[PDB]
Amino acid sequence: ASLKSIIRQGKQTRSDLKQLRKSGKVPAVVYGYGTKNVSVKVDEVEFIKVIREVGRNGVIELGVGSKTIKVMVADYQFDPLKNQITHIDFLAIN
Amino acid sequence: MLLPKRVKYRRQHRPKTTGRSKGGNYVTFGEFGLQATTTSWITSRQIESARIAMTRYMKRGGKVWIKIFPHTPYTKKPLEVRMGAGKGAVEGWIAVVKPGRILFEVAGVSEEVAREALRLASHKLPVKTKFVKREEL
Amino acid sequence: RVNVTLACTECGDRNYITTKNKRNNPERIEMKKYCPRLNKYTLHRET
Amino acid sequence: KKGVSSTKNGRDSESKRLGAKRADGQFVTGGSILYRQRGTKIYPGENVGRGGDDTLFAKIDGVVKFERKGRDKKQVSVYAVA
Amino acid sequence: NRLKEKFNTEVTENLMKKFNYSSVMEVPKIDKIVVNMGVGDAVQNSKVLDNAVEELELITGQKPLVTKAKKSIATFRLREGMPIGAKVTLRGERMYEFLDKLISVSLPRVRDFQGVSKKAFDGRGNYTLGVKEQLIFPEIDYDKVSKVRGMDIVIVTTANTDEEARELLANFGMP
Amino acid sequence: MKQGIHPEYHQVIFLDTTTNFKFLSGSTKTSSEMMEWEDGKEYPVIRLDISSDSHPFYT
Amino acid sequence: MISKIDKNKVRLKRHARVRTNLSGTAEKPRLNVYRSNKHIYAQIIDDNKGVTLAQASSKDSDIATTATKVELATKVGEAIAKKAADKGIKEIVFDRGGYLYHGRVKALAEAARESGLEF
RNA sequence: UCUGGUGACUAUAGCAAGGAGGUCACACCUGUUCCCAUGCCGAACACAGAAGUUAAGCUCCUUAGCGUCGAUGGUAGUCGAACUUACGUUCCGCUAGAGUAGAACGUUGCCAGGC
RNA sequence: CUGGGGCGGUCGCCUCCUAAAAGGUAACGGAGGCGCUCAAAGGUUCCCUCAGAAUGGUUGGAAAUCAUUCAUAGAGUGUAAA
RNA sequence: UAUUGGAGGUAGAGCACUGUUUGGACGAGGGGCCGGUUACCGAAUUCAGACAAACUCCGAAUGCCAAUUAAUUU
């Protein structure tokens, strides 16, 4: 429950997003009490490992910059054909 | 899963067959499911063939849910007629499908039996398919 | 339904055309309208 | 050419050139039709009138401005400064 | 003004503590009663209407207004606006004297086992009963009449629900 | 009281032999055989009944 | 069971239905009337700017006294006329609120007409 | 900000619930003789009156059950382009609907008495 | 006119969709109406709000009329459709 | 063309309306019978699903109309 992420930047076009999804990572955003609207990206495999480790709900340590955010998955996106995760939403409880 | 009991307008413009599944992309009722990967019509008669195959192959075992209903009527002109003079009469009922549209769902039966049943259904069906389980995680 | 020409009872001129049903109003329909000769409102009958 | 097969629907009316007739910002003279309609897609507002045919026409000279009435209804206005 | 007097000195007295109310304005008060004749088959008849107008205009102090049919109904001939039934409202003192009269003429002719009625209600405090014009017209005899009908009697009260209509049925009546 | 052309009512003294329940009314504008004052000086049109005498519950 | 209501909500339905044509301008302002179970008010208002230009009521101590309510209306009307003449208002549009033009509202209107206001 | 008119805003304004309060304003109320009053009630409407009472309407305060509003990120779609004949692919702008976080039990103008 | 003529159908007006979110836009394309009616179903003034549903009952073909809280108009608007 | 302002309901979505529909709750009507019971069957009421040229609580891209107005052209 100690997943890390990387900070997204502005104006990520269609090509950038689809390349990013075609590598082993997936974009996401965080929000909620205790933080602001930060857009990040996580590596898919470790997300899946964490989720099967904790399940649907889990107070997860999330790696952004230097600060770890107690966060749980509000909700998520999936591609049924070509099985691959598409966008994860995260809310912080703290 | 054959025909709509009544429709308002019986002669209708044919359906668009270009794009992606508007919905029904998930297993909701059953446990395992069968989705499509191309996009053809389904004529209210090939799904009948398919549910029979599955049901009779499970030997009246677990439950089945057909997820595609033939809503659209289609017309065919009478034989050896020229072009023009109106629109023809209804020949069958269809339901367009899209890549990603779940078609059939099953539950209350082992995994291998379900996969075999959906395989046998796939061959009575005009679209490439895929075996899927209840999405979780 | 029939066409009716209304005429000024005083002036005498046919100044208006209108309509009536001959079963609902079987009688000569009367009504006040403007006679443009007498600059006044007179009675006009479907005469 | 086929034969006896015949259809019972080959009929239509002549469309009426309804819709907008002026745009926000332009100078309309009084009387100018702004929006030919049926019923009330747009109600008259300030210095605007309702014809018998639900037509909307400016009462006076001025600029034309389309606006909101409540939640799901629109009006029209005309303002004279020019 | 009999039940009238019995209200402010006895209903106001007893019901005010049979149930707790913070002010005196919170007390059940009878507002009026609608005395609709109901519906008699005057499709081939039109006479049964003015005789029905005799009743109520005679029994109550006022004539029933003939509310014609709303929607057009088959089976019997009620076309949109067929004059049928009746309607009368008692608001002022007449509500009282007529009520009193009712409870002082109930027992002889109704032959009710309970005395007047039971759980004939609509669940919110209104009688929705029906008589067979047995008790009514004590004044004018059964001798000058021709049919057997019954009103859609209701209770218009500041009371809340028929549970309260029972405690105000202790207003001389028979629950 | 649907007024205007409303018919003639009266709070008459229904002075019956059974409790003299002269607290009623109606269109029974009959002869006042008992022109009393405690009750209405009107007809005691009620002459005999069981409302105050013989109930099936309280006989 | 039926619920009695205060008579003001229904009133404010008819007043708006009359306000639909009646709108006060600076040249021709609107005279409203607010009748209570014991009082009657009146305001002259230009709706093109949303400003009350004059006011008068049966509570206003100058007019408060002991009369028949129709009679103090005859005084509220007279006062509103005076206040308006000072500001320079001749023609007005009488808004009857949502009250039937009768009794008090009528009395007030008639009074304001006899005392100058041209409506 | 109280209190009452009046009107300006996309229900962030509403419904339901709980709880106050009648500051003399507000409704409730007594009655029909008085103009008036109702195809059919002093119901309402109108009217004369103010002895009863805040209970309800109303007012104020709470609460997001309920209503509405509602991003960011994205996805669908598509303008232009380049491939292409595929139920297409790529690039570049624009960018929904749905959903999720959340806003929200109003803001406000003039007038008259208030404090 | 006519997916060659012939046979069948059609021909002028109004409404809807096809029609690609201004307007316009064709086929022997998909649906329907018109050749009237109203001395009130016109003008104006003042009033009033509906269908259905249950908690229901003298009738109760069920629902006629009557009652009561919700009814966003689910009703009505002379007629086709918008 | 850049920047404002606006009319309109297509693509897409959605089921709030007209309908078209697949499973699951839940009480009940004629009726299996003696008004009946229980199955059901015609719906009421829900929860999850879907479909639409002549469905729309919503709603682009672009086109169109016009501007206190700019810049380049003719």
Side-chain angles (χ1 to χ4, degrees), chain A residues 1-60 62-69 71 73-74 76-81 84-93, chain B residues 1-59 61-62 64-78 81-134 137, chain C residues 1-9 11-47, chain D residues 1 3 6-52 54-82, chain E residues 3-12 14-16 19-35 37-75 77-78 81 83-100 102-109 114-175, chain F residues 1-10 16-18 26 32 37-40 44 50 52-56, chain G residues 1-59 61 64 66-70 72-77 79-88 90 92-117 119:
Chain A
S2 99
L3 183 63
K4 92 174 289 323
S5 66
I6 296 177
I7 265 48
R8 293 178 66 188
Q9 33 297 315
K11 148 214 163 293
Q12 216 84 30
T13 70
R14 186 169 263 141
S15 168
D16 295 345
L17 261 278
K18 162 198 325 153
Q19 261 171 297
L20 187 153
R21 193 145 20 221
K22 181 174 71 68
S23 304
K25 344 278 181 53
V26 60
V29 298
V30 302
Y31 40 81
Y33 154 70
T35 187
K36 92 158 82 93
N37 232 308
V38 152
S39 55
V40 300
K41 64 188 179 180
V42 300
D43 191 300
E44 189 189 41
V45 179
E46 307 71 320
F47 173 54
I48 293 159
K49 323 214 163 113
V50 202
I51 290 296
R52 57 177 29 111
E53 190 277 331
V54 69
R56 181 66 178 171
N57 332 296
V59 169
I60 304 332
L62 179 63
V64 175
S66 59
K67 47 166 307 213
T68 286
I69 302 171
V71 70
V73 186
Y76 100 112
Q77 288 175 22
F78 194 58
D79 191 8
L81 302 137
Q84 293 177 335
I85 293 185
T86 44
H87 168 234
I88 322 193
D89 287 53
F90 280 128
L91 60 176
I93 315 79
Chain B
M1 226 85 189
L2 295 52
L3 62 80
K5 293 179 179 179
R6 293 182 183 174
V7 275
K8 198 170 182 219
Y9 292 106
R10 270 209 110 201
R11 320 182 152 117
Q12 270 181 236
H13 292 165
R14 271 110 69 222
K16 169 118 100 183
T17 320
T18 18
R20 284 289 299 281
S21 276
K22 197 166 109 223
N25 287 16
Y26 291 43
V27 185
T28 84
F29 311 141
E31 141 185 41
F32 312 93
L34 187 86
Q35 93 190 340
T37 61
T38 36
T39 153
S40 160
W41 297 1
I42 301 299
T43 71
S44 147
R45 158 113 83 181
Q46 306 156 162
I47 319 154
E48 183 178 2
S49 188
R51 163 217 83 57
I52 298 165
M54 272 153 18
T55 70
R56 78 87 38 71
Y57 160 77
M58 290 167 187
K59 316 118 163 53
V64 188
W65 306 266
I66 294 178
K67 301 297 288 324
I68 61 155
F69 191 84
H71 290 287
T72 335
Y74 84 85
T75 65
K76 193 143 181 300
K77 276 279 217 178
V81 83
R82 281 195 223 242
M83 299 285 96
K87 178 152 162 87
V90 176
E91 193 110 5
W93 295 89
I94 73 190
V96 69
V97 298
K98 309 284 195 177
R101 172 81 74 151
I102 295 280
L103 298 60
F104 304 73
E105 259 158 293
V106 291
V109 86
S110 160
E111 148 158 53
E112 289 71 311
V113 168
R115 200 177 307 231
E116 185 54 28
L118 314 204
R119 193 201 146 241
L120 293 158
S122 179
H123 291 142
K124 274 75 174 176
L125 230 56
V127 65
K128 289 181 178 286
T129 53
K130 267 270 304 308
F131 170 80
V132 278
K133 330 102 163 183
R134 221 209 155 81
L137 187 153
Chain C
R1 298 209 137 251
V2 304
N3 301 93
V4 148
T5 311
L6 290 167
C8 179
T9 42
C11 327
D13 81 26
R14 263 177 236 171
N15 19 31
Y16 291 101
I17 72 107
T18 194
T19 291
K20 88 171 166 96
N21 212 339
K22 15 87 166 123
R23 137 181 312 140
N24 290 346
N25 283 71
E27 82 287 322
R28 281 104 24 229
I29 50 137
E30 258 166 32
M31 92 183 48
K32 293 179 179 179
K33 281 204 116 77
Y34 197 67
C35 185
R37 193 201 317 271
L38 318 171
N39 186 340
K40 68 206 280 313
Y41 274 41
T42 57
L43 199 55
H44 298 242
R45 193 177 290 91
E46 175 206 353
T47 299
Chain D
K1 354 111 47 141
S6 297
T7 203
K8 316 182 82 303
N9 56 353
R11 298 153 335 251
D12 188 6
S13 72
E14 184 74 275
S15 296
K16 275 70 175 172
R17 282 57 161 179
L18 323 166
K21 300 294 187 291
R22 299 292 183 184
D24 306 39
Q26 67 189 123
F27 189 62
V28 294
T29 45
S32 296
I33 302 192
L34 287 352
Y35 199 94
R36 319 201 74 161
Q37 55 174 309
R38 305 209 173 311
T40 58
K41 267 174 154 113
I42 338 248
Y43 303 96
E46 337 314 343
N47 323 332
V48 182
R50 182 177 179 179
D54 303 343
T55 293
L56 296 176
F57 63 92
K59 289 286 200 64
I60 46 89
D61 279 345
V63 65
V64 20
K65 288 285 142 98
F66 310 67
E67 298 122 359
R68 220 174 201 247
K69 281 198 19 163
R71 216 195 242 257
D72 36 7
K73 267 70 145 133
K74 309 175 201 227
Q75 60 186 36
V76 173
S77 302
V78 180
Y79 304 136
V81 162
Chain E
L3 177 63
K4 218 182 307 303
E5 232 53 44
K6 183 230 154 153
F7 183 88
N8 179 50
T9 36
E10 265 159 279
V11 202
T12 88
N14 59 45
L15 268 291
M16 203 321 288
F19 269 156
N20 284 320
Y21 312 120
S22 80
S23 253
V24 317
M25 296 297 103
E26 214 140 272
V27 310
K29 190 166 37 83
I30 186 95
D31 155 17
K32 56 168 181 295
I33 44 145
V34 63
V35 193
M37 167 266 211
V39 54
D41 198 63
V43 318
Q44 60 268 284
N45 326 303
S46 74
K47 47 230 190 203
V48 310
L49 281 183
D50 289 345
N51 292 346
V53 202
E54 178 38 305
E55 303 128 26
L56 305 140
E57 183 178 2
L58 200 57
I59 304 72
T60 85
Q62 288 117 24
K63 183 178 179 180
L65 63 63
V66 203
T67 73
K68 288 86 55 203
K70 295 230 298 213
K71 313 289 279 236
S72 191
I73 311 284
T75 72
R77 291 305 119 231
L78 222 69
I84 25 84
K87 182 140 156 190
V88 170
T89 54
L90 281 296
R91 278 197 183 269
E93 292 83 4
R94 340 185 47 71
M95 170 207 333
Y96 302 106
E97 292 83 4
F98 193 52
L99 177 33
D100 289 345
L102 185 54
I103 167 58
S104 78
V105 86
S106 35
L107 297 316
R109 298 89 155 151
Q114 205 283 336
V116 296
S117 295
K118 316 302 298 143
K119 197 38 127 73
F121 275 113
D122 211 292
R124 249 199 298 263
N126 295 259
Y127 248 177
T128 58
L129 177 63
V131 293
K132 274 38 91 183
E133 68 175 84
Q134 292 177 358
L135 295 174
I136 326 188
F137 54 90
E139 322 149 38
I140 45 144
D141 266 345
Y142 104 103
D143 299 83
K144 190 134 37 43
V145 317
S146 83
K147 26 190 280 163
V148 317
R149 263 321 83 201
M151 314 63 58
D152 198 79
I153 297 100
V154 280
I155 338 156
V156 188
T157 44
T158 295
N160 269 41
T161 53
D162 57 3
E163 63 87 19
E164 265 140 353
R166 290 299 192 110
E167 345 239 332
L168 277 302
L169 200 29
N171 286 352
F172 296 161
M174 294 300 293
Chain F
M1 65 182 179
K2 339 286 238 147
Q3 266 226 353
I5 21 200
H6 70 120
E8 70 311 2
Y9 225 53
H10 43 278
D16 202 289
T17 189
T18 77
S32 187
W37 183 257
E38 78 298 350
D39 302 343
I50 77 193
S52 182
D53 269 347
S54 325
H55 318 69
Chain G
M1 221 267 285
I2 62 170
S3 51
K4 309 310 181 173
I5 59 173
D6 152 33
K7 295 181 176 67
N8 212 54
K9 8 229 98 23
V10 189
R11 200 262 325 190
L12 52 91
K13 250 89 238 359
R14 306 175 197 167
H15 177 28
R17 302 196 103 158
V18 317
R19 273 294 327 285
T20 185
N21 329 291
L22 210 153
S23 266
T25 76
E27 199 230 332
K28 197 134 73 73
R30 160 184 61 125
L31 179 61
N32 199 75
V33 150
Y34 174 62
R35 150 199 313 173
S36 100
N37 279 356
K38 308 282 236 311
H39 282 74
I40 180 155
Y41 297 70
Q43 293 177 335
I44 279 183
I45 152 120
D46 160 355
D47 286 289
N48 270 104
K49 190 182 334 293
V51 297
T52 293
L53 250 58
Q55 160 292 119
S57 212
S58 133
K59 183 180 68 65
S61 53
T66 355
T68 59
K69 219 155 41 184
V70 183
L72 244 187
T74 335
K75 316 286 172 273
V76 194
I80 214 55
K82 293 179 179 179
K83 273 128 168 190
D86 314 354
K87 331 280 205 131
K90 267 310 298 273
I92 71 76
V93 232
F94 185 64
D95 155 37
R96 39 175 197 91
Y99 310 98
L100 302 80
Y101 186 79
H102 194 253
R104 284 207 255 163
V105 171
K106 179 183 277 172
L108 200 135
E110 289 311 272
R113 277 193 218 251
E114 326 218 302
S115 41
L117 294 180
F119 73 108

